[PDB]
Amino acid sequence: MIQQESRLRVADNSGAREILTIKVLGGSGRKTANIGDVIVATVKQATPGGVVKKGEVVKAVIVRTKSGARRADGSYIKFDENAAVIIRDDKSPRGTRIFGPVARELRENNFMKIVSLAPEVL
Amino acid sequence: AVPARRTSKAKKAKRRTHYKLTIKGLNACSNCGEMKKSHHVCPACGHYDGKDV
Amino acid sequence: NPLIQELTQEQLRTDIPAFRPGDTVRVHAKVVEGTRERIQLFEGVVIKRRGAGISETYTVRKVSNGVGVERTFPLHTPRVAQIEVVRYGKVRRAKLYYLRALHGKAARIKEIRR
Amino acid sequence: SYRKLGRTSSQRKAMLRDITTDLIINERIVTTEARAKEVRSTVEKMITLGKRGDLHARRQAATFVRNEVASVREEDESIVVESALQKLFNDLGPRFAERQGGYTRILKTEPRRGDAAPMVVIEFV
Amino acid sequence: KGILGKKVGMTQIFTESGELIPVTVVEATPNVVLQVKTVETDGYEAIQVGYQDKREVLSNKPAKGHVAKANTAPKRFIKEFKNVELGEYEVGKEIKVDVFQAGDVVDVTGTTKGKGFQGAIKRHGQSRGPMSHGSRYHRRPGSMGPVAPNRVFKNKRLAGRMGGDRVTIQNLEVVKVDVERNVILIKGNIPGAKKSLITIKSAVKA
RNA sequence: AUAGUGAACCAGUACCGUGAGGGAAAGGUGAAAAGCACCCCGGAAGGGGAGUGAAAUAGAUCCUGAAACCGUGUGCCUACA
RNA sequence: GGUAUGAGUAGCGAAAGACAGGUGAGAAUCCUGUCCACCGUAUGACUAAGGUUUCCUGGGGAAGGCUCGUCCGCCCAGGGU
RNA sequence: UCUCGUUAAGGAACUCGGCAAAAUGACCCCGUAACUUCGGGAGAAGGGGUGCUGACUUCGGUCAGCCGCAGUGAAUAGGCC
RNA sequence: GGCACCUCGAUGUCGGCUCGUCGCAUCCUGGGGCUGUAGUCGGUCCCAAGGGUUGGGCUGUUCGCCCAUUAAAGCGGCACGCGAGCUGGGUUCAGAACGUCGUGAGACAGUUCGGUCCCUAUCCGUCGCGGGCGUUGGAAAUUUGAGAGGAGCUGUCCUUAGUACGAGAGGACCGGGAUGGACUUACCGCUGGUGUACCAGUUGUUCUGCCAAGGGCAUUGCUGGGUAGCUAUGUAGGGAAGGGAUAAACGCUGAAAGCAUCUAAGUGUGAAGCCCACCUCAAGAUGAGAUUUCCCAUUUCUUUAAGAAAGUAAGACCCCUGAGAGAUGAUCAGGUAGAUAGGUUGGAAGUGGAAGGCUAGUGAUAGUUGGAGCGGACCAAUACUAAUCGGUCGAGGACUUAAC
Ligand SMILES: [K+]
Ligand SMILES: [K+]
Ligand SMILES: [K+]
Ligand SMILES: [K+]
Ligand SMILES: [K+]
Ligand SMILES: [K+]
Ligand SMILES: [K+]
Ligand SMILES: [K+]
Ligand SMILES: [K+]
Ligand SMILES: [K+]
Ligand SMILES: [K+]
Ligand SMILES: [K+]
Ligand SMILES: [K+]
Ligand SMILES: [K+]
Ligand SMILES: [K+]
Ligand SMILES: [K+]
Ligand SMILES: [K+]
Ligand SMILES: [K+]
Ligand SMILES: [K+]
Ligand SMILES: [K+]
Ligand SMILES: [K+]
Ligand SMILES: [K+]
Ligand SMILES: [K+]
Ligand SMILES: [K+]
Ligand SMILES: [K+]
Ligand SMILES: [K+]
Ligand SMILES: [Mg+2]
Ligand SMILES: [Mg+2]
Ligand SMILES: [Mg+2]
Ligand SMILES: [Mg+2]
Ligand SMILES: [Mg+2]
Ligand SMILES: [Mg+2]
Ligand SMILES: [Mg+2]
Ligand SMILES: [Mg+2]
Ligand SMILES: [Mg+2]
Ligand SMILES: [Mg+2]
Ligand SMILES: [Mg+2]
Ligand SMILES: [Mg+2]
Ligand SMILES: [Mg+2]
Ligand SMILES: [Mg+2]
Ligand SMILES: [Mg+2]
Ligand SMILES: [Mg+2]
Ligand SMILES: [Mg+2]
Ligand SMILES: [Mg+2]
Ligand SMILES: [Mg+2]
Ligand SMILES: [Mg+2]
Ligand SMILES: [Mg+2]
Ligand SMILES: [Mg+2]
Ligand SMILES: [Mg+2]
Ligand SMILES: [Mg+2]
Ligand SMILES: [Mg+2]
Ligand SMILES: [Mg+2]
Ligand SMILES: [Mg+2]
Ligand SMILES: [Mg+2]
Ligand SMILES: [Mg+2]
Ligand SMILES: [Mg+2]
Ligand SMILES: [Mg+2]
Ligand SMILES: [Mg+2]
Ligand SMILES: [Mg+2]
Ligand SMILES: [Mg+2]
Ligand SMILES: [Mg+2]
Ligand SMILES: [Mg+2]
Ligand SMILES: [Mg+2]
Ligand SMILES: [Zn+2]
Structure with missing residues (x-):
């Protein structure tokens, strides 16, 4: 459950290390975003040599959350942290490598490039 | 908040319609015949359910 | 309880x-x-x-x-074909939520070989 | 559920232990309706432990029954003092060996003067 | 189609293809048609249904006489079902859970669980005032209204008794029918405390 | 007797104030106590009798005993306004 | 000055009591017992001031005591430095 | 309504304002910036250790072992920049 | 802005919070005409108020600028709605200071830091809940629906179709699907929360004489878990289809007026709107409705009385055990024609290996006896305890006129 002012780790090498949620997209009053949802975020901490830099407004897809997700088989998945991947407008990741495991729910949202790049898809 | 008008005798009496006691559940003791509260020990003879208790 | 139990035993x-x-x-x-x-x-x-x-x-x-x-x-x-027990751990409580705070060497559990 | 009896948990537990032991010692006491309806379960759970008669049962009962003198007799000497705990396991336990539950009865009596609180008598058998 | 049962409880069931779904267990010992109402006599068509046999001492001569035509024991719950084929029903006929089939879309009516006297926050989903910053306004129901009417408009929502209301949940799915146990499994949850009366009818919107 | 002295009465008192100082309320059984022996209910209070008295619904909070106010009985009326 | 209305309503002043036995017309509230609980750089022990009889003993239950009361720092009678 | 305890995910988005609360908190050890009136700033900051049982001691430790989620295992003792 | 008519024996002043409600000169969504409307986007006017109409940065602010969204992020009224509902940052009470003015005390033609927000609701009103009587014999159930309340929002993607349209670029109407946001009705099986008479660990001190095992106090001492119940952030469902009458608008046929013309007669199409449809309440709907079933015509006294009175019938209640119900009433489950509660016996959740032993070890401790012991509310049995014994109330049914 990610809302405005929620901060997430960056699960790629785009350059950003930490982002802050500006907006949960997808409706007028939507409060919360979960895995697979796209947010507008600001870069609060950036790797010095990276492409994405501190202060930049970016779009990003949530790929893991402490409040994870429920599947139709009655099973659940939860992660120890909240992480996002910075994406271009066509959902392609800005960076070249994804870090950490990724929820299988990205597939059904058609974030194929992230899913293919992730070291593990749980 | 304070009463805007004093309450009349009639209105006060009407309010106290339901301000009353009731005396419910008295019947004769099966041992001594004096009236008692049902399901209670008879305070006169000390019996209950036909037995001294 | 018994009725719900009978409906689900199958x-x-x-x-x-x-x-x-x-x-x-x-x-x-x-x-x-x-x-x-x-x-x-x-x-x-x-x-x-x-x-x-x-x-x-x-x-x-x-x-x-x-x-x-x-x-x-x-x-x-x-949807789970098999649950396989790899090792038996020695713990002291039913719920191991405290492992969430630990990492690496601290999170280790001693084997018991039941 | 369980009644709160106008006390805090620790205050209530103290009172239930006090009254439960009072019942074990006197076998008949006067209390309010509310206290009686709560004591009837605590006293009969103590009796169940006394019926078990084993050390583990004794020690569980010891955590609840008060350390009070239940009786003094000249059975052997003028210093044979029996505790509330010992009466539970020596006398009351064997007394109800063949009754399955229901070791107490409550008899409703008059209300208390200064309170109008509904009084009762709670007694064994 | 309709039947009266009691809410037993909630559980879950695995479907074919492995999906896990919550279900409410409704036990409906066969209902009995006690009376048939027609335009000729009552001005409207309906069947009067009895459910849950009741002990004789709990019944009345007026009540025992009423169920005498159907030739059954006294029934605790008696309800009417409208918009059915009356000719297909007659007094003394029994209605069983097998009237419904797995996959049927139903409407489920019951009496919501009582909650007693509740404040406008819980009863009406209103917003608290702030809990700090000098606030002395936490769980209060808000302004009663403007000055001009010199009164409060009706439907100013306040504290009061909550629950105990008839509520119908629409378009629920019948997941299973265990006839030997007189049990119907409904997907999801339905109103009412356990052991309360539940009315299952084929979905009106269907 | 809310008058007349603040004070008809144990008043410059009680009471208030550190103090100077401020400062009340409060008269009436009956001709005579003859102020109800004795009995009864009650722990008493208080009543009911019996007495005293011309009268006690004159019994001491005692002459008269207004009104507000409180209650009991009930002739008529009152639960679609 | 008297008496209403609000009312039989607000309030009954920071906290643990329980039961047995007793006393008595009457007791949650007085006495006794038992266990329980609270203070303990104190809620203990002294003492100055201030109060001025509140001390002790025996009686009492009108009023005072925020309930009750058989009890009291209250009342009555004796005493005490 | 007051006083108090616990809260999923988020973590100042609240609000005039982080008001209120939360967090810090003891002792030992490592370590500690700009600036300075050279005293200070400092308890800056930021870190580590703390229980139990044996062995061994230069008497402060050291080694070893042991248990728990957690060892100033409760109470009371800075939030910082 | 003008006036000075109510209020100066006081009608509390901005902004915000809570709660909304109304108007429509409509922001979005729905319908439509004209277009300098190819399409896609639009412009403009008409109809339309059913619902919807975001969160932040700065400022006391309203406003406004900005950030990021959105189908949209409408404008107004309600003492610039709402301080006996909240806040009190702003509005110069007393303090203090700056600029400025003054010889000055002081002051603003201005700023700055700091500064007590009382009230136990009587009446109407509002939201809930009972008692009374009525409804024309007395009862137990089931009902119709006068009337009322609730609900009413909308995105994106796919398909039709890269089709119609267009030189390209771009790119549909209508139709058919899927899936969301916000809101909302329920419910706790799931994920979680809580869980102060559930389980465990642990510190200090104190008590059970000591050891062992335990109790007390320390926020429930603290800590880790956690049942029932209550719950969201969890789960399920909802605003689906569809009629009828209409708005703007478009007709059809048609004359007045040989033509023309939607109108005059006649007749049709047409909106998220109206009335239904969907949900809930509902005959105190005094207009008091309907249906099924039960009791059945008593006694006495007065009297032609719709008389008074007395036992009762069906039935209901008192009282008592309770809960799925609950402030109290009430509701519902029961009262031995008995499982209603307690206990008891089995379980379960939950905790996570009791005590007492034994084995190993110098010991702390470990293993074992043994998934043990404990186990509020959950489940199932069981009359062991308590629902004893009883009492109260409760019909005998008017008249007139149709018909039969
Ligand atoms: K008796
Ligand atoms: K006289
Ligand atoms: K009168
Ligand atoms: K008065
Ligand atoms: K009064
Ligand atoms: K005395
Ligand atoms: K917030
Ligand atoms: K510093
Ligand atoms: K440690
Ligand atoms: K400190
Ligand atoms: K004025
Ligand atoms: K408005
Ligand atoms: K247009
Ligand atoms: K509208
Ligand atoms: K702001
Ligand atoms: K601000
Ligand atoms: K005004
Ligand atoms: K105010
Ligand atoms: K006002
Ligand atoms: K009024
Ligand atoms: K201890
Ligand atoms: K203690
Ligand atoms: K918990
Ligand atoms: K009726
Ligand atoms: K053991
Ligand atoms: K177990
Ligand atoms: Mg405690
Ligand atoms: Mg005792
Ligand atoms: Mg809010
Ligand atoms: Mg407050
Ligand atoms: Mg008006
Ligand atoms: Mg005078
Ligand atoms: Mg005079
Ligand atoms: Mg004078
Ligand atoms: Mg006279
Ligand atoms: Mg006189
Ligand atoms: Mg009328
Ligand atoms: Mg009338
Ligand atoms: Mg009042
Ligand atoms: Mg007190
Ligand atoms: Mg202490
Ligand atoms: Mg101290
Ligand atoms: Mg004395
Ligand atoms: Mg004395
Ligand atoms: Mg008194
Ligand atoms: Mg939280
Ligand atoms: Mg958390
Ligand atoms: Mg802010
Ligand atoms: Mg804000
Ligand atoms: Mg603070
Ligand atoms: Mg500590
Ligand atoms: Mg003039
Ligand atoms: Mg005035
Ligand atoms: Mg218009
Ligand atoms: Mg106001
Ligand atoms: Mg000058
Ligand atoms: Mg000016
Ligand atoms: Mg200040
Ligand atoms: Mg749950
Ligand atoms: Mg459960
Ligand atoms: Mg020991
Ligand atoms: Mg049962
Ligand atoms: Mg388990
Ligand atoms: Zn008797």
Whole structure:
């Protein structure tokens, strides 16, 4: 459950290390975003040599959350942290490598490039 | 908040319609015949359910 | 209770090995990426077992690529081919939520060989 | 559920232990309705432990029954003092060996003067 | 189609293809048609249904006489079902859970669980005032209204008794029918405390 | 007797104030106590009798005994306004 | 000055009591016992001031005591430095 | 309504304002910046250790072992920049 | 802005919070005409108020600028709605200071830091809940629906179709699906929360004489879990289809007026709107409705009385055990024609290996006896305890006129 002012780790090498949620997209009053949802975020901490830099407004897809997700088989998945991947407008990741495991729910949202790049898809 | 008008005798009496006691559940003791509260020990003879208790 | 128990006894699995929180299990999870179906092995420590009858579930925790990941399964889900007990751990409580705070060497559990 | 009886948990537990032991010692006491309806379960749970008669049962009962003198007799000497705990296991336990539950009865009596609180008598058998 | 049963409880069931779904167990020992109402006599068509046999001492001569035509024991719950084929029903006929089939779309009516006297926050989902910053306004129901009417408009929502209301949940799915046990499994949850009366009818919107 | 002195009465008192100082309320059984022996209910209070008295619904909070106010009985009326 | 209305309503002043036995017309509230609980750089022990009989003993239950009361720092009778 | 305890995910988005609360908190050890009136700033900051049982001691430790989620295991003792 | 008519024996002043409600000169969504409307986007006017109409940065602010969204992020009224509902940052009470003015005390043609927000609701009103009587014999159930309340929002994607349209670029109407946001009705099986008479660990001190095992106090001492119940952030469902009458608008046929013309007669199409449809309440709907079933015509006294009175019938209640119900009433489950509660016996959740032993070890401790012991509310049995014994109330049914 990610809302405005929620901060997430960056699960790629785009350059950003930490982002802050500006907006949960997808409706007028939507409060919360979960895995697979796209947010507008600001870069609060950036790797010095990276492409994405501190202060930049970016779009990003949530790929893991402490409040994870429920599947139709009655099973659940939860992660120890909240992480996002910075994406271009066509959902392609800005960076070249994804870090950490990724929820299988990205597939059904058609974030194929992230899913293919992730070291593990749980 | 304070009463805007004093309450009349009639209105006060009407309010106290339901301000009353009731005396419910008295019947004769099966041992001594004096009236008692049902399901209670008879305070006169000390019996209950036909037995001294 | 008895009526709900009778309605559900048919769907209780009988291939559940005896395991408790703190044991290491390999969960054979059936996954579907479309038409095809596949087994994805989720291995880790059972940190939780709650519920009764058909509603019983358990949680398995593993650390993959630096990130802790917990998976909760219905004990009797047909979507799990097999629950395999890898090792028996020595713990002192039913719920192992304290492992969430630990990492690496601190999170280790001593084997007991039941 | 369980009644709160106008006390805090620790205050209530103290009172239930006090009254429960009072019942074990006197076998008949006067209390309010509310206290009697709560004591009837605590006293009969103590009796169940006394019926078990084993050390583990004794020690569980010891955590609840007060350390009070239940009787003094000249059975052997003028210093044979029996505790509330010992009466539970020596006398009351064997007394109800063949009754399955229901070791107490409550008899409703008159209300208390200064309170109008509904009084009762709670006694064994 | 309709039937009266009691809410037993909630559980869950695995479907074919392995999906786990919550279900409410409704036990409906066969209902009995006690009376048939027609335009000729009552001005409207309906069947009067009895459910849950009741002990004789709990019944009345007026009540025992009423169920005498159907030739059954006294019934605790008696309700009417409208918009059915009356000719297909007659007094003394029994209605069983097998009237419904797995996959049928139903409407489920019951009496919501009582909650007693509740404030406008819980009863009406209103917003608290702030809990700090000098606030002395936490769980209060808000302004009663403007000055101009010199009164409060009706439907100013306040504290009061909550629950105990008839509520119908629409378009629920019948998941299973265990006739030997007189049990119907409904997907999802339905109103009412356990052991309360539940009315299952084929979905009106269907 | 809310008058007349603040004070008809144990008043410059009680009471208030550190103090200077401020400062009340409060008269009436009956001709005579003859102020109800004795009995009864009650722990008493208080009543009911029996007495005293011309009268006690003159019994001491005692002459007269207004009104507000409180209650009991009930002739008529009152639950679609 | 008297008496209403609001009312039989607000309030009954920071906290643990329980039961047995007794006393008595009457007791949650007085006495005794038992266990329980609270203070303990104190809620203990002294003492100055201030109060001025509140001390002790025996009686009492009108009023005072925020309930009750058989009890009291209250009332009555004796005493005490 | 007051006083108090616990809260999923988020973590100042609240608000005039982080008001209120939360967090810090003891002792030992490592370590500690700009600036300075050379005293200070400092308890800056930021870190580590703390229980139990044996062995061994230069008497402060050291080594070893043991248990728990957690060892100033409760209470009371800075939030910082 | 003008006036000075109510209020100066006081009608509390901005902004915000809580709660909304109304108007429509409509922001979005719905319908439509004209277009300098190819399409896609639009412009403009008409109809339309059913619902909807975001969160932040700065400022006391309103406003406004900005950031990021959105189908949209409408404008107004309600003492610039709402301080006996809240806040009190702003509005110069007393303090203090700056600029400025003054010889000055002081002051603003201005700023700055700091500064007590009382009230136990009597009446109407509002939201809930009972008692009384009525409804024309007395009862137990089931009902119709006068009337009323609730609900009413909308995105994106796929398909039709890269089709119609267009030189390209771009790119549909209508139709058919899927899936969301916000809101909302329920419920706790799931994920979680809580869980102060559930389980465990642990510190200090104190008590059970000591050891062992335990109790007390320390926020429930603290800590880790956690049942029932209550719950969201969890789960399920909902605003689906469809009629009828209409708005703007468009007709059809048609004359007045040989033509033309939607109108005059006649007749049709047409909106998220109206009335239904969907949900809930509902005959105190005094207009008091209907249906099924039960009791059945008593006694006495007065009297032609719709008389008074007395036992009762069906039935209901008192009282008592309770809960799924609950402030109290009430509701519902029961009262031995008995499982209603307690206990008891089995279970379960939950905790996570009791005590007492034994084995190993110098010891702390470990293993074992043994998934043990404990186990509020959950489940199932069981009359062991308590629902004893009883009492109260409660019909005998008017008249007129149709018909039969
Ligand atoms: K008796
Ligand atoms: K006289
Ligand atoms: K009168
Ligand atoms: K008065
Ligand atoms: K009064
Ligand atoms: K005395
Ligand atoms: K917020
Ligand atoms: K510093
Ligand atoms: K440690
Ligand atoms: K400190
Ligand atoms: K004025
Ligand atoms: K408005
Ligand atoms: K247009
Ligand atoms: K509208
Ligand atoms: K702001
Ligand atoms: K501000
Ligand atoms: K005004
Ligand atoms: K105010
Ligand atoms: K006002
Ligand atoms: K009024
Ligand atoms: K201890
Ligand atoms: K203690
Ligand atoms: K919990
Ligand atoms: K009626
Ligand atoms: K053991
Ligand atoms: K167990
Ligand atoms: Mg379990
Ligand atoms: Mg305590
Ligand atoms: Mg005792
Ligand atoms: Mg809010
Ligand atoms: Mg407050
Ligand atoms: Mg008006
Ligand atoms: Mg004078
Ligand atoms: Mg005079
Ligand atoms: Mg004078
Ligand atoms: Mg006279
Ligand atoms: Mg006189
Ligand atoms: Mg009328
Ligand atoms: Mg009338
Ligand atoms: Mg009042
Ligand atoms: Mg007091
Ligand atoms: Mg202490
Ligand atoms: Mg101290
Ligand atoms: Mg004395
Ligand atoms: Mg004395
Ligand atoms: Mg008194
Ligand atoms: Mg939280
Ligand atoms: Mg958390
Ligand atoms: Mg802010
Ligand atoms: Mg804000
Ligand atoms: Mg603060
Ligand atoms: Mg500590
Ligand atoms: Mg003039
Ligand atoms: Mg005035
Ligand atoms: Mg218009
Ligand atoms: Mg106001
Ligand atoms: Mg000057
Ligand atoms: Mg000016
Ligand atoms: Mg200040
Ligand atoms: Mg739940
Ligand atoms: Mg459950
Ligand atoms: Mg010891
Ligand atoms: Mg049962
Ligand atoms: Zn008797």
